[PDB]
Amino acid sequence: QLPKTETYNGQESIRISTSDILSGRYDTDFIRNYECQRLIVQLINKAFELRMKDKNV
Amino acid sequence: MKELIYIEEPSILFAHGQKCTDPRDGLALFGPLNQIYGIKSGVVGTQKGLQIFKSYLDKIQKPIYNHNNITRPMFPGFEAVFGCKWESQNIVFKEITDEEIRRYLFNASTHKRTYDLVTLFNDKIITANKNDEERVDVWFVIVPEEIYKYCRPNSVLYNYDAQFHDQLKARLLEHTIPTQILRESTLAWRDFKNTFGAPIRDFSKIEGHLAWTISTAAYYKAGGKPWKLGDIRPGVCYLGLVYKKIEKSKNPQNACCAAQMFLDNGDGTVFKGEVGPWYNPEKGEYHLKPKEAKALLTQALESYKEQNKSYPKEVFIHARTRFNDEEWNAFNEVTPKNTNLVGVTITKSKPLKLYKTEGAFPIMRGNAYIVDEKKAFLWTLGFVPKLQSTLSMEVPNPIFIEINKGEAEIQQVLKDILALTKLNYNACIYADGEPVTLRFANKIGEILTASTEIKTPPLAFKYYI
RNA sequence: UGAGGUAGUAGGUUGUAUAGU
DNA sequence: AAACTATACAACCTACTACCTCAT
């Protein structure tokens, strides 16, 4: 869907382990822990919605 | 692997210091703690409403039955259940002309019709009790069914409220008159049918509950105490705090908070929390600014001092919203060092539907699910074996409790709100989901919000329910 | 009395109209 | 007197707090 994404470099991406997030042992200036778990539940909800729309129901 | 702990069913006192668990059966077996000498009924309405009320009262005088006493117990008669006497004589009746109803009917907007009818009933009651020598403890407003139907807020052919009884009690609050509105179809269902030919207000099996509720409301509004709580510690004060918001247009709703207070008995001493034009309805987070918080706390403390002479050792606060830090900090320094302050939030929007593997039975009422020290669940709804039925409908839903600040035992507040759920007076049900400090909360907020013009509401409860 | 219906914002995302030295 | 350029709150991007009614 995006033909200009072919030149992306993965070093600019940043990854954070979910273990300390779910254990409440992650806290950074970039993302708040409350904001992080909010992003997590949002991702869960959106993935669930896309999963049932892929069910053809 | 977690389990569900059990909280015992709380007990309510009765006559001669007797302890039961059901209010109806305990009343039928023992009766009230304190006796009243006699009540005198007053009625306003048409002569048709007068004869309907007379027929229903003499029917109440007779012992009436239901299908079975396991769930809906039979009514042993008002005299045999309360020790008070009800008669069809010495009754003060005021007539309303139906021609005036016809004159008020053809108005364009139903709001002014509601206003004029409500004011007509109000000053009729005021005139009736300001001239008649015969004392009337409870006035029975027999509203006609077509008035309740055709004069609805959205019926199709600002501080005043469109609800009839809301405005009725709001403008009757300034004269200390215990009134109770009775819908006509409730006690005239025998001759009331639908268009098909059936009573849509059917009580062919269930009228015993109606007799029970009407009788206990009449006794409570008379002045007598039907039942109280069993065990109350020396120095614990419950504060069920209202956090219901109205949608009062461009008028600043802000915080229409009120507060209920149970200290030693079932006595509720509601003092009017401020309207508080701070934090306009764009800011409706119910964050109480310190001056009003300390004013309400001072009201509660002064009421406790007047009723008990001793400083309370622990204040229980019940609400339904989250509590911010500055509000509790304002709540702290006014309280003495010896006492303790703790806040509980009760909510329904949290979903938790516990189902059953075999059979078709729900969760037995009294189960407590503990998630943490702060958060916990209480199943105040569902099956109860004393009833041999469920108080809930379909699947019960619990109330999510959570202590915010202060140190207290979680099972202590669990059993305390379980005991608080048993004190419903307007309806003689076994128990309700929300506690009675929160059950009365929305209704008394609706009562107070319907008349801004008052400044010192009475702190009793007869003029509200 | 409890499950569907509904306006409107927690609190930090990114667009109006500046003024700081 | 003027170069960069973020500023100072502010309008809004998905889902939290509460209402209100529909009929069992």
Coordinates of C-alpha atoms (C1' of nucleotides) in Angstrom, one line a residue:
Chain A
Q1 CA 0.0 0.0 0.0
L2 CA 3.0 2.4 0.5
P3 CA 5.5 2.1 -2.4
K4 CA 7.8 4.7 -0.8
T5 CA 8.4 2.4 2.3
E6 CA 11.0 0.4 0.4
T7 CA 13.8 2.7 1.6
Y8 CA 13.1 2.4 5.3
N9 CA 16.0 1.5 7.6
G10 CA 15.3 -0.4 10.8
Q11 CA 17.9 1.3 13.0
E12 CA 15.5 4.3 13.5
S13 CA 12.9 1.9 15.1
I14 CA 13.0 1.5 18.8
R15 CA 11.9 -1.7 20.6
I16 CA 10.8 -2.0 24.3
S17 CA 10.3 -5.3 26.0
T18 CA 6.8 -6.0 27.2
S19 CA 7.9 -7.9 30.3
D20 CA 8.8 -4.8 32.3
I21 CA 5.8 -3.0 30.9
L22 CA 3.4 -5.7 32.1
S23 CA 5.3 -6.2 35.4
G24 CA 5.1 -2.4 36.0
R25 CA 8.9 -2.2 35.9
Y26 CA 9.3 0.0 32.8
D27 CA 9.2 3.8 32.9
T28 CA 10.9 6.1 30.4
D29 CA 10.6 9.7 29.3
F30 CA 9.4 8.8 25.8
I31 CA 6.3 6.8 26.9
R32 CA 4.6 6.8 30.2
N33 CA 3.8 3.4 31.7
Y34 CA 0.1 4.3 31.8
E35 CA 0.4 5.5 28.2
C36 CA 2.2 2.3 27.3
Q37 CA -0.5 0.0 28.7
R38 CA -3.1 2.2 27.1
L39 CA -1.3 1.7 23.8
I40 CA -1.3 -2.1 24.6
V41 CA -5.0 -2.3 25.2
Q42 CA -5.7 -0.2 22.1
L43 CA -3.6 -2.6 20.1
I44 CA -5.5 -5.5 21.5
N45 CA -8.8 -4.0 20.7
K46 CA -7.9 -3.1 17.2
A47 CA -6.4 -6.5 16.5
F48 CA -9.5 -8.2 17.8
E49 CA -11.7 -6.1 15.6
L50 CA -9.6 -6.8 12.5
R51 CA -9.6 -10.5 13.5
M52 CA -13.4 -10.7 13.6
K53 CA -13.7 -8.8 10.4
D54 CA -11.4 -11.4 8.8
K55 CA -13.8 -14.1 10.0
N56 CA -16.4 -12.9 7.4
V57 CA -19.2 -12.3 9.9
Chain B
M1 CA -5.1 -20.1 42.7
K2 CA -7.7 -17.6 44.0
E3 CA -11.1 -18.4 45.5
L4 CA -14.1 -16.3 46.4
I5 CA -14.3 -15.5 50.1
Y6 CA -17.7 -15.5 51.9
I7 CA -19.3 -12.7 53.8
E8 CA -22.1 -13.7 56.1
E9 CA -25.6 -12.2 55.5
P10 CA -26.0 -9.2 57.7
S11 CA -28.7 -9.0 60.3
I12 CA -31.3 -6.3 61.1
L13 CA -32.7 -5.7 64.5
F14 CA -36.4 -5.9 65.3
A15 CA -38.9 -5.6 68.2
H16 CA -37.7 -6.6 71.7
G17 CA -34.1 -6.7 70.5
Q18 CA -34.8 -9.5 68.1
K19 CA -32.4 -10.3 65.2
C20 CA -33.5 -11.5 61.8
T21 CA -32.4 -11.4 58.2
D22 CA -35.6 -10.6 56.3
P23 CA -37.4 -7.3 56.9
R24 CA -40.8 -8.6 55.9
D25 CA -40.8 -11.8 57.9
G26 CA -39.1 -10.0 60.9
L27 CA -41.8 -7.3 60.8
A28 CA -44.5 -9.9 60.6
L29 CA -43.0 -11.9 63.5
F30 CA -41.8 -9.1 65.8
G31 CA -42.5 -5.6 64.4
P32 CA -40.9 -2.2 64.8
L33 CA -38.4 -1.3 67.4
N34 CA -40.3 1.7 68.5
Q35 CA -44.1 2.1 68.5
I36 CA -46.1 5.1 67.3
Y37 CA -49.5 5.8 68.7
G38 CA -51.4 6.2 65.5
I39 CA -51.3 7.8 62.0
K40 CA -53.9 9.9 60.3
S41 CA -54.1 9.6 56.5
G42 CA -54.7 12.6 54.2
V43 CA -55.6 12.4 50.6
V44 CA -55.7 14.8 47.7
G45 CA -57.4 13.8 44.4
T46 CA -60.8 13.3 42.9
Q47 CA -63.6 11.4 44.6
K48 CA -62.8 8.5 42.4
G49 CA -59.3 8.5 43.7
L50 CA -60.8 8.8 47.2
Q51 CA -62.9 5.7 46.9
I52 CA -60.1 3.8 45.2
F53 CA -57.8 4.7 48.1
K54 CA -60.5 3.7 50.6
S55 CA -61.0 0.4 48.9
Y56 CA -57.3 -0.3 48.8
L57 CA -56.8 0.7 52.5
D58 CA -59.6 -1.6 53.6
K59 CA -58.1 -4.4 51.5
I60 CA -54.8 -3.7 53.2
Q61 CA -56.6 -4.0 56.5
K62 CA -57.6 -7.6 55.6
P63 CA -54.8 -10.2 55.6
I64 CA -54.1 -10.7 51.9
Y65 CA -52.2 -13.6 50.4
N66 CA -49.8 -14.3 47.5
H67 CA -48.8 -17.4 45.5
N68 CA -46.4 -18.6 48.2
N69 CA -44.6 -17.1 51.2
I70 CA -41.2 -18.5 50.2
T71 CA -40.4 -15.5 48.0
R72 CA -43.2 -13.0 48.5
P73 CA -44.6 -13.4 52.0
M74 CA -48.2 -12.8 52.8
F75 CA -49.4 -9.6 54.5
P76 CA -50.7 -10.3 58.0
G77 CA -52.5 -6.9 58.3
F78 CA -51.1 -3.5 59.1
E79 CA -52.2 -3.7 62.8
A80 CA -50.7 -7.2 63.3
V81 CA -47.4 -6.3 61.6
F82 CA -46.7 -2.8 63.0
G83 CA -48.8 -2.4 66.1
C84 CA -50.3 0.8 64.7
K85 CA -53.9 1.3 63.7
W86 CA -55.1 2.2 60.2
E87 CA -58.7 3.2 59.7
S88 CA -61.0 4.5 57.0
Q89 CA -62.4 7.2 59.3
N90 CA -60.9 10.6 60.5
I91 CA -59.4 11.0 57.0
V92 CA -58.9 14.4 55.6
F93 CA -59.8 14.6 51.9
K94 CA -59.3 17.5 49.5
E95 CA -61.0 17.3 46.1
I96 CA -59.5 18.5 42.8
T97 CA -62.0 19.5 40.1
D98 CA -61.7 17.7 36.8
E99 CA -62.9 20.8 35.1
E100 CA -59.7 22.5 36.1
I101 CA -57.9 19.5 34.7
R102 CA -59.8 20.1 31.4
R103 CA -58.9 23.8 31.5
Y104 CA -55.2 23.0 32.0
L105 CA -55.2 20.2 29.4
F106 CA -55.4 22.3 26.2
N107 CA -52.2 24.2 26.9
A108 CA -49.5 24.2 24.2
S109 CA -46.3 23.2 26.1
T110 CA -46.7 20.6 28.7
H111 CA -44.0 22.2 31.0
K112 CA -46.3 25.1 32.1
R113 CA -49.1 22.6 32.6
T114 CA -46.8 20.6 34.8
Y115 CA -45.9 23.8 36.7
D116 CA -49.4 24.9 37.3
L117 CA -50.7 21.5 38.3
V118 CA -47.7 21.0 40.7
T119 CA -48.2 24.4 42.3
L120 CA -52.0 23.7 42.6
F121 CA -51.3 20.5 44.4
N122 CA -48.7 22.2 46.5
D123 CA -50.7 25.1 47.7
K124 CA -53.8 22.9 48.1
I125 CA -51.7 20.8 50.5
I126 CA -50.4 23.9 52.3
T127 CA -53.9 25.3 52.6
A128 CA -55.2 22.0 53.8
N129 CA -52.6 21.6 56.6
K130 CA -52.6 25.3 57.5
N131 CA -56.3 25.4 58.3
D132 CA -57.5 21.9 59.3
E133 CA -57.2 21.1 63.0
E134 CA -56.9 17.4 62.4
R135 CA -53.2 16.5 62.2
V136 CA -52.2 14.6 59.0
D137 CA -49.0 12.7 59.4
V138 CA -48.8 11.5 55.8
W139 CA -50.5 13.1 52.8
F140 CA -51.4 10.6 50.0
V141 CA -51.3 12.3 46.6
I142 CA -53.5 10.1 44.3
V143 CA -52.4 11.4 40.9
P144 CA -54.6 10.2 38.0
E145 CA -53.1 7.9 35.4
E146 CA -53.8 10.1 32.5
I147 CA -52.0 13.0 34.2
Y148 CA -48.9 10.8 34.5
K149 CA -49.3 9.6 30.9
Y150 CA -50.3 12.6 28.8
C151 CA -48.2 15.2 30.7
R152 CA -44.9 13.5 30.4
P153 CA -41.8 15.6 29.7
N154 CA -41.7 14.4 26.0
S155 CA -45.5 13.9 25.8
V156 CA -46.9 15.1 22.4
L157 CA -50.6 15.9 21.9
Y158 CA -35.3 26.4 34.1
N159 CA -34.5 25.1 37.6
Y160 CA -38.0 23.7 37.9
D161 CA -38.1 20.0 37.0
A162 CA -40.5 18.4 34.7
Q163 CA -41.0 15.3 36.9
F164 CA -44.1 15.6 39.0
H165 CA -43.1 14.1 42.4
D166 CA -39.6 15.7 42.1
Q167 CA -41.1 19.2 42.0
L168 CA -43.8 18.1 44.6
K169 CA -41.3 17.1 47.2
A170 CA -38.9 19.9 46.3
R171 CA -41.4 22.7 46.9
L172 CA -43.0 20.8 49.9
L173 CA -39.5 20.5 51.5
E174 CA -39.8 24.0 52.9
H175 CA -42.7 23.2 55.3
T176 CA -41.8 19.8 56.8
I177 CA -44.7 17.7 55.5
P178 CA -44.2 14.0 55.0
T179 CA -45.9 13.2 51.7
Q180 CA -46.1 10.1 49.4
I181 CA -47.3 10.2 45.9
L182 CA -49.5 7.2 44.9
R183 CA -50.0 6.4 41.2
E184 CA -53.7 5.6 40.5
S185 CA -53.0 2.5 38.4
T186 CA -50.9 1.0 41.1
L187 CA -53.9 0.7 43.5
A188 CA -56.7 0.6 40.9
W189 CA -55.3 -2.2 38.7
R190 CA -58.5 -4.2 39.2
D191 CA -60.5 -2.0 36.9
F192 CA -57.5 -0.9 34.8
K193 CA -56.9 -2.8 31.5
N194 CA -54.9 -2.2 28.3
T195 CA -56.3 -1.7 24.8
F196 CA -56.1 -5.5 24.2
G197 CA -58.2 -6.2 27.3
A198 CA -55.5 -7.1 29.8
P199 CA -54.1 -5.3 32.9
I200 CA -50.7 -4.1 31.8
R201 CA -50.2 -3.0 35.5
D202 CA -51.0 -6.6 36.6
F203 CA -50.8 -7.7 40.2
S204 CA -52.9 -10.9 40.0
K205 CA -50.2 -12.7 42.0
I206 CA -47.8 -10.1 43.4
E207 CA -50.0 -7.5 45.2
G208 CA -48.7 -8.7 48.6
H209 CA -45.4 -6.9 47.8
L210 CA -47.3 -3.8 47.0
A211 CA -49.1 -4.0 50.3
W212 CA -45.8 -4.6 52.1
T213 CA -44.0 -1.6 50.5
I214 CA -47.0 0.7 51.0
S215 CA -47.4 -0.3 54.6
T216 CA -43.7 0.1 55.5
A217 CA -43.4 3.4 53.7
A218 CA -46.5 4.7 55.6
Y219 CA -45.0 3.6 58.9
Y220 CA -41.6 5.0 58.1
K221 CA -43.0 8.4 57.0
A222 CA -45.2 8.5 60.1
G223 CA -42.1 8.7 62.4
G224 CA -41.6 5.2 63.6
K225 CA -38.4 3.3 62.8
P226 CA -39.2 -0.1 61.2
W227 CA -35.8 -1.7 61.6
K228 CA -32.2 -0.7 62.3
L229 CA -28.7 -2.2 62.0
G230 CA -27.3 -4.8 64.4
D231 CA -23.7 -4.0 65.2
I232 CA -22.3 -0.5 64.9
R233 CA -18.9 0.3 66.5
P234 CA -18.5 3.1 69.0
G235 CA -17.2 5.9 66.8
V236 CA -17.8 4.8 63.2
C237 CA -19.7 7.2 60.9
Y238 CA -20.8 6.3 57.4
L239 CA -20.9 9.1 54.8
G240 CA -22.6 8.1 51.6
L241 CA -21.7 11.0 49.4
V242 CA -23.8 11.9 46.3
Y243 CA -21.9 12.4 43.0
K244 CA -24.9 12.5 40.6
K245 CA -24.7 15.3 38.0
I246 CA -27.7 17.0 36.4
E247 CA -27.6 18.4 32.9
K248 CA -28.8 21.8 33.8
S249 CA -28.4 23.5 30.4
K250 CA -26.1 26.6 30.5
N251 CA -26.8 27.0 34.3
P252 CA -23.6 25.9 36.0
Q253 CA -24.2 22.4 37.3
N254 CA -20.6 22.0 38.5
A255 CA -21.0 19.7 41.5
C256 CA -24.6 19.0 42.7
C257 CA -23.1 16.8 45.5
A258 CA -25.0 15.9 48.6
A259 CA -24.3 13.5 51.5
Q260 CA -26.0 10.8 53.5
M261 CA -24.9 9.9 57.0
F262 CA -25.5 6.8 59.1
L263 CA -23.9 7.0 62.5
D264 CA -25.6 4.8 65.2
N265 CA -28.9 3.7 63.7
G266 CA -30.7 3.9 60.3
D267 CA -31.1 7.6 60.9
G268 CA -30.0 9.6 57.8
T269 CA -29.0 13.2 58.3
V270 CA -28.6 14.7 54.9
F271 CA -27.0 18.1 54.8
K272 CA -27.0 20.0 51.5
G273 CA -23.7 20.0 49.8
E274 CA -23.0 23.2 47.9
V275 CA -23.9 23.9 44.3
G276 CA -20.4 25.4 44.0
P277 CA -20.2 27.5 40.9
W278 CA -16.5 26.7 40.6
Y279 CA -15.6 24.2 37.9
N280 CA -18.2 25.0 35.3
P281 CA -19.8 21.9 33.6
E282 CA -16.8 21.7 31.2
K283 CA -15.0 20.7 34.4
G284 CA -17.1 18.0 35.9
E285 CA -14.6 15.7 37.6
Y286 CA -16.2 16.2 41.0
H287 CA -13.0 17.5 42.6
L288 CA -14.2 19.3 45.7
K289 CA -12.4 22.5 46.5
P290 CA -11.1 22.6 50.1
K291 CA -13.6 25.2 51.6
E292 CA -16.7 23.2 50.6
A293 CA -15.0 19.9 51.6
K294 CA -14.2 21.2 55.1
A295 CA -17.7 22.8 55.3
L296 CA -19.3 19.4 54.5
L297 CA -16.9 17.6 56.9
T298 CA -17.8 20.2 59.6
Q299 CA -21.5 19.6 58.9
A300 CA -21.0 15.9 59.4
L301 CA -18.9 16.3 62.5
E302 CA -21.4 18.8 64.1
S303 CA -24.3 16.4 63.3
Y304 CA -22.3 13.6 65.0
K305 CA -21.6 15.8 68.0
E306 CA -25.3 16.7 68.3
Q307 CA -26.5 13.1 68.0
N308 CA -23.7 11.4 70.0
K309 CA -21.7 14.0 72.1
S310 CA -18.5 12.0 71.3
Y311 CA -16.0 12.5 68.6
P312 CA -16.1 9.7 66.0
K313 CA -13.2 7.4 65.8
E314 CA -13.5 6.5 62.1
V315 CA -15.3 8.1 59.1
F316 CA -16.5 5.9 56.3
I317 CA -17.0 7.7 53.0
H318 CA -18.9 6.1 50.1
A319 CA -19.0 7.6 46.7
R320 CA -18.8 6.5 43.0
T321 CA -16.0 8.6 41.5
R322 CA -12.2 8.6 41.8
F323 CA -10.7 10.8 44.6
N324 CA -7.9 13.2 43.9
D325 CA -5.1 14.1 46.3
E326 CA -6.1 17.7 47.2
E327 CA -9.6 16.8 48.2
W328 CA -8.4 14.1 50.6
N329 CA -5.8 16.6 51.9
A330 CA -8.6 19.0 52.6
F331 CA -10.5 16.1 54.2
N332 CA -7.5 15.3 56.5
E333 CA -6.5 18.3 58.5
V334 CA -10.0 19.2 59.7
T335 CA -10.4 15.7 61.1
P336 CA -8.7 15.1 64.5
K337 CA -5.6 13.0 64.9
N338 CA -7.4 10.2 66.7
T339 CA -10.0 9.5 64.0
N340 CA -9.4 7.9 60.6
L341 CA -10.6 8.8 57.2
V342 CA -11.1 6.3 54.3
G343 CA -12.9 6.6 51.0
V344 CA -14.7 3.9 49.0
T345 CA -15.8 4.1 45.4
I346 CA -18.8 2.0 44.2
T347 CA -19.4 1.4 40.5
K348 CA -21.5 -0.7 38.2
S349 CA -19.9 -0.1 34.8
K350 CA -17.2 -2.6 35.5
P351 CA -18.3 -5.8 33.8
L352 CA -17.9 -9.2 35.5
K353 CA -20.5 -11.9 34.8
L354 CA -19.9 -15.0 36.7
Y355 CA -21.8 -17.9 35.2
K356 CA -22.6 -21.4 36.5
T357 CA -21.6 -24.8 35.1
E358 CA -24.5 -27.0 35.8
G359 CA -28.1 -26.2 36.5
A360 CA -29.7 -22.8 35.9
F361 CA -28.9 -21.0 39.1
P362 CA -27.0 -17.7 39.5
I363 CA -24.2 -16.6 41.9
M364 CA -25.4 -16.8 45.6
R365 CA -25.5 -13.3 47.1
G366 CA -22.7 -12.6 49.5
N367 CA -19.7 -13.8 47.5
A368 CA -16.7 -11.5 47.7
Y369 CA -13.9 -11.6 45.1
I370 CA -10.7 -9.9 46.2
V371 CA -8.3 -8.8 43.6
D372 CA -5.9 -6.7 45.7
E373 CA -5.8 -5.0 49.1
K374 CA -7.3 -1.9 47.5
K375 CA -9.7 -3.3 44.9
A376 CA -12.3 -5.9 45.7
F377 CA -15.6 -7.2 44.4
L378 CA -18.8 -7.9 46.3
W379 CA -21.8 -9.9 45.0
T380 CA -24.7 -8.1 46.6
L381 CA -27.0 -9.4 43.9
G382 CA -28.0 -13.0 42.9
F383 CA -29.5 -15.9 44.7
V384 CA -30.2 -15.9 48.4
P385 CA -31.4 -19.1 50.1
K386 CA -33.7 -17.3 52.6
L387 CA -35.7 -16.2 49.6
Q388 CA -35.1 -19.4 47.6
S389 CA -34.8 -17.1 44.5
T390 CA -32.5 -14.6 43.0
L391 CA -32.9 -10.9 43.8
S392 CA -31.1 -10.1 40.5
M393 CA -32.4 -10.6 36.9
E394 CA -30.8 -13.0 34.5
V395 CA -27.2 -12.9 35.6
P396 CA -26.2 -10.7 38.6
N397 CA -23.5 -8.1 38.3
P398 CA -21.4 -7.1 41.3
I399 CA -20.3 -3.7 42.6
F400 CA -16.6 -3.0 42.1
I401 CA -15.3 -1.4 45.3
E402 CA -11.9 0.2 45.8
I403 CA -10.5 1.9 48.9
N404 CA -8.5 4.9 47.8
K405 CA -6.8 6.4 50.9
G406 CA -6.4 5.4 54.5
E407 CA -5.7 2.1 56.2
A408 CA -8.6 -0.3 56.9
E409 CA -9.5 -4.0 56.6
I410 CA -11.0 -4.8 53.2
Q411 CA -13.4 -7.4 54.6
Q412 CA -14.5 -4.8 57.2
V413 CA -15.8 -2.4 54.6
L414 CA -17.1 -5.4 52.6
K415 CA -19.4 -6.5 55.4
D416 CA -20.2 -2.9 56.3
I417 CA -21.5 -2.1 52.9
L418 CA -23.3 -5.4 52.9
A419 CA -25.0 -4.3 56.0
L420 CA -25.7 -0.9 54.4
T421 CA -27.4 -2.6 51.5
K422 CA -30.2 -3.9 53.8
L423 CA -31.6 -0.5 54.9
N424 CA -33.9 0.2 51.9
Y425 CA -37.1 1.9 53.2
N426 CA -39.1 3.1 50.1
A427 CA -39.2 -0.4 48.7
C428 CA -39.4 -3.4 51.0
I429 CA -37.2 -5.6 48.9
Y430 CA -34.8 -8.0 50.5
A431 CA -31.7 -6.1 49.2
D432 CA -30.6 -3.9 46.3
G433 CA -27.4 -3.7 44.4
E434 CA -26.3 -0.2 45.2
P435 CA -26.2 0.6 48.9
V436 CA -29.0 2.7 50.4
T437 CA -26.6 5.6 50.9
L438 CA -26.1 5.5 47.1
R439 CA -29.7 4.4 46.4
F440 CA -31.2 7.4 48.1
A441 CA -28.4 9.5 46.6
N442 CA -29.7 10.0 43.1
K443 CA -33.3 10.6 44.2
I444 CA -32.4 13.1 46.9
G445 CA -30.1 14.9 44.4
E446 CA -33.1 15.0 42.0
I447 CA -35.2 16.4 44.8
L448 CA -32.7 19.1 45.8
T449 CA -31.9 20.0 42.1
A450 CA -35.6 20.7 41.4
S451 CA -35.8 23.8 43.7
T452 CA -32.7 26.1 44.0
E453 CA -34.8 28.6 46.0
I454 CA -34.4 26.7 49.3
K455 CA -31.4 27.2 51.5
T456 CA -31.9 25.0 54.6
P457 CA -33.5 21.7 53.6
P458 CA -34.7 19.5 56.5
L459 CA -32.2 16.7 57.2
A460 CA -34.9 14.0 57.8
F461 CA -36.0 11.5 55.2
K462 CA -39.8 11.5 55.3
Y463 CA -40.0 14.4 52.9
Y464 CA -37.8 12.7 50.3
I465 CA -38.7 9.1 49.6
Chain C
rU1 C1' -33.3 -3.6 38.0
rG2 C1' -30.3 -4.5 34.3
rA3 C1' -28.7 -4.3 29.6
rG4 C1' -29.1 -1.2 25.4
rG5 C1' -28.8 4.0 24.0
rU6 C1' -26.2 8.4 24.3
rA7 C1' -23.5 13.3 24.9
rG8 C1' -18.9 14.4 26.3
rU9 C1' -14.4 14.2 28.4
rA10 C1' -9.9 11.8 31.4
rG11 C1' -5.0 13.6 29.4
rG12 C1' -1.7 14.1 26.3
rU13 C1' -2.0 14.1 20.3
rU14 C1' -0.9 18.2 16.7
rG15 C1' -3.5 22.9 14.3
rU16 C1' -5.2 28.3 15.4
rA17 C1' -2.5 33.1 15.8
rU18 C1' 1.0 35.0 17.9
rA19 C1' 5.8 37.8 20.0
rG20 C1' 10.4 37.0 22.3
rU21 C1' 14.8 39.7 22.1
Chain D
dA1 C1' 16.7 46.9 15.9
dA2 C1' 16.4 41.8 14.2
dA3 C1' 18.1 36.4 13.1
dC4 C1' 15.6 31.0 14.2
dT5 C1' 12.0 28.9 16.3
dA6 C1' 10.1 27.2 19.6
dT7 C1' 6.3 29.3 22.5
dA8 C1' 1.4 29.2 25.3
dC9 C1' -2.1 27.3 25.8
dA10 C1' -5.4 24.6 22.6
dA11 C1' -8.5 21.7 19.4
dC12 C1' -9.1 17.5 19.2
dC13 C1' -7.6 11.3 18.9
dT14 C1' -9.2 6.7 20.8
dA15 C1' -11.9 5.2 24.8
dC16 C1' -12.8 6.8 30.8
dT17 C1' -16.7 9.0 34.1
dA18 C1' -21.6 9.8 34.6
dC19 C1' -26.8 10.2 32.6
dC20 C1' -31.8 8.1 31.0
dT21 C1' -35.1 5.1 29.3
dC22 C1' -37.3 0.4 27.6
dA23 C1' -39.2 -2.7 28.6
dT24 C1' -38.7 -7.8 30.9

